[PDB]
Design a protein around this ligand. Structure first.
Ligand SMILES: O=C(O)c1nc(=O)[nH]c2c1CCCC2
Length: 160
């Protein structure tokens, strides 16, 4: 019985068998959130570069870090941006399946400084759902805002 859950906490303190890093295509560490993923799994950033709309797994010991590069909507068109966001989540599902993990910690891609200053909770979450709905892994979504936690919780509830 694989479930969706949401937790308002630092993804770097996840209790899942792998994590998804909200990554840049340069495989570079970044600030804010990514700075805490880097600090907890720094050697996961060795050759972690992957193009926009792709995912790449780097092992930190035996702990898989899935570098998922959602589009920067500042740079992309709404329609291509949407295409790239869907693709990234699809590659995450592929990686989660290939790794054979029973659970994954995943943020909402392209909802922070890649959002183009827009609210993409529903857009990002629905693409997450489309991709992960075909996997048998428990999915734990990580956010920081209070409301977002609630809106994500409700969206999970009203599919079951
Ligand atoms: O806006 C986001 O949450 C986001 N989604 C990504 O897929 N990648 C990255 C970010 C922000 C930090 C830089 C990399």
């Amino acid at each position: 019985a694989p479930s969706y859950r949401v937790k308002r906490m630092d993804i770097a303190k996840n209790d899942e068998e792998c994590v998804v890093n909200a990554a840049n295509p340069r495989g570079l560490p970044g600030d804010g959130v990514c700075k805490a993923v880097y600090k907890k799994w720094p050697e996961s950033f060795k050759n972690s570069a992957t193009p926009v709309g792709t995912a790449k797994t780097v092992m930190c010991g035996t702990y898989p870090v899935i570098h998922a590069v959602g589009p920067n909507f500042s740079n992309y068109s709404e329609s291509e941006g949407d295409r790239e966001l869907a693709a990234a989540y699809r590659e995450v599902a592929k990686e989660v399946t290939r790794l054979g993990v029973n659970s994954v910690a995943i943020p909402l891609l392209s909802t922070g400084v890649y959002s183009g200053g827009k609210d993409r909770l529903t857009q990002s979450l629905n693409h997450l759902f489309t991709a992960m709905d075909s996997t048998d892994a428990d999915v734990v979504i990580y956010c920081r805002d209070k409301e977002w936690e609630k809106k994500i919780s409700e969206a999970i509830q009203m599919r079951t």
